[PDB]
Structures are given as C-alpha cells and as structure tokens.
Design an enzyme around this catalytic site. Sequence first.
Site, PDB file in Angstrom:
ATOM      1  CB  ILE A  24      -0.961   0.032   1.206  1.00 22.22           C
ATOM      2  CG1 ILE A  24      -0.183  -0.027   2.522  1.00 22.22           C
ATOM      3  CG2 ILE A  24      -1.953  -1.118   1.125  1.00 22.22           C
ATOM      4  CD1 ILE A  24      -1.067   0.081   3.753  1.00 22.22           C
ATOM      5  CB  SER A  26       6.559   0.609  -2.802  1.00 28.08           C
ATOM      6  OG  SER A  26       5.976   1.000  -4.034  1.00 28.08           O
ATOM      7  N   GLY A  30       9.992   3.908   2.500  1.00 29.78           N
ATOM      8  CA  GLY A  30       9.760   2.532   2.892  1.00 29.78           C
ATOM      9  C   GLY A  30       8.640   1.859   2.119  1.00 29.78           C
ATOM     10  CB  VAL A  32       3.653   0.767   3.741  1.00 25.83           C
ATOM     11  CG1 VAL A  32       2.641   0.540   4.855  1.00 25.83           C
ATOM     12  CG2 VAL A  32       4.694   1.795   4.158  1.00 25.83           C
ATOM     13  CB  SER A  98      -1.854   9.853   4.552  1.00 28.09           C
ATOM     14  OG  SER A  98      -2.126  10.242   3.217  1.00 28.09           O
ATOM     15  CD  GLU A 100       0.510  13.731   0.238  1.00 29.68           C
ATOM     16  OE1 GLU A 100       0.858  12.585  -0.117  1.00 29.68           O
ATOM     17  OE2 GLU A 100       1.323  14.664   0.409  1.00 29.68           O
ATOM     18  CG  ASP A 141       9.695  14.127   6.434  1.00 26.94           C
ATOM     19  OD1 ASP A 141       9.837  15.198   5.810  1.00 26.94           O
ATOM     20  OD2 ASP A 141       9.524  13.029   5.858  1.00 26.94           O
ATOM     21  CB  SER A 145       2.113  12.156   3.135  1.00 27.64           C
ATOM     22  OG  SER A 145       3.469  12.244   3.538  1.00 27.64           O
ATOM     23  CG  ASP A 159       7.973   8.536   7.840  1.00 25.32           C
ATOM     24  OD1 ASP A 159       9.068   8.188   8.336  1.00 25.32           O
ATOM     25  OD2 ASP A 159       7.777   8.576   6.606  1.00 25.32           O
TER      26      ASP A 159
END
Length: 284
Positions: A24, A26, A30, A32, A98, A100, A141, A145, A159
Amino acid sequence: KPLRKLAFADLLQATNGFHNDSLIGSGGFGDVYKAILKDGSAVAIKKLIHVSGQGDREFMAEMETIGKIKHRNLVPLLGYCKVGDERLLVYEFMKYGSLEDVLHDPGVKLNWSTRRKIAIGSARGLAFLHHNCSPHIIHRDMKSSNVLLDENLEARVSDFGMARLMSAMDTHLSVSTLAGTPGYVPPEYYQSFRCSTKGDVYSYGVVLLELLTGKRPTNLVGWVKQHAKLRISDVFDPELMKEDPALEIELLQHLKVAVACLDDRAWRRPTMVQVMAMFKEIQA
C-alpha cells in the site's frame, strides 16, 4: 503494551511473501504492507529500504523515538523485525489512511469540525514530542502524508524515520544532512545543518494551511502571506464556506495560528503548547 519482536517468517506469511496485493505504498522511504498477523491483529508493515546506510539509521530513529513512547495522537509502533539485512517495522493499521490522500481525493469528505480535531490532535502529538518527552523529539518531517487517521478520524502523527533526540538543555540540534519535504522545509533549515522544535512548528503550520486552504503546499505559504496583504477571505477551502459562512471568524483565527507558525523567524514562532492553548481559547 510492550514493543514486540516479531519473527521474520510471520511478517513474510502475513503479507503472503510480500505480495503486491498487500503493498500500500513503496519506494522513497519505505515499502508498506497492509496485513493481518496470525493472532488477528490488523497492522501496517513497513519494509525498510537501503539497510546499512540510510535504512538502518531510519530503523533506529523510530526504535529510539516512537518505539519508546505511546500517545493518543501518535501512530503506535507495535513491533519490529531486525534480522540480517532485513529491517521491518509494524504499526497499528490506520483505516482512513493519510490526511494527504483524503485532502487530495482518490474518499471521505472532511467537514470543518473534524478538520479542527485533526489539527488539534496533530498539534497535541507534536506538543507531547517537544515538551513531555525528555529528551525532546524533533520529528523533522511533519506533513499531511505523515498524518494518519484511525476509525474515528482522529489524527495520529507517523513516520519517525528522520526523527532525532534533543536534550532539554539545548535550543537546537546540529545534524549531518538536510532532511524534510519540499513545501514543508523551514527556511532556516536551508541556511545551516541545524534542526529544532521550532522547525517542526513551521512544518505543522503548512499542514494547518492544507486543512484551511484545501490546497497542496506545492509555494502555498508564499502567496498566502501575499494574499494576507490583500483579502484573507479568498484562501479558505471552498467546501468549508459551503457548510456555514458563519464559522469564517474562527477560520481567520485558526489562520492566525497557521501564519504565526510559518514565520521566517524561528524565535517568533509559537511553541506547540502555545498552539494548543490558542486552539482552546477560540471555542471556549
């Protein structure tokens, strides 16, 4: 709820050999996967990229931050897998993805009352990182998102791959590289290899603008500050004014919070505690 050490084999079969159907998200940072553990836990499994370099540092960054704390507005790190050259991290699944993905529809329409909860929620998460944690945690960060939404559509910050620890006896932390996402980077982060909680506040501001404006950061902060010189009743999300043109008064005040966070001068920015206090003063 201790941090579980999950066997690599479990993660392997839970994702059906890391099949594409489970993927879901990439690349970039990372890979996921959406999965169900053998005990029925609904989880998200991040398969880390570029081990023994950017990947391993990212692994320890999360382990030493999010992995050692728990909070209502922080995505919980449920477990980890440190086997050989494989680094995996396991989180509770966030139903509605997210912020976003939602603000940039593929979804779920976000009314203002929920957006303000997302704003308060996300703010509380960073506040916990900056003030309640010793050493303090700088996320580095913060962005839309990295704001996830559970079944109750409450914001949970995610994250911590670039997060760093800072002593409370320091105003800033000097780093090795420039970290962040374009459209969110604090202007002073371009001038020196130093990060801070005030840097996080700036990034938070952008997210608060996304909730208010409904626009992507890519800049947004720029002409908002320029339209602030003109008419402010022109930047808000059109779908927000449709609900009720009466709440434009708190929107402006919420916009006043966003613009303070986005000040070029780090000293002039509010702390996330002051942000929380400002949010509380508006409704009651």
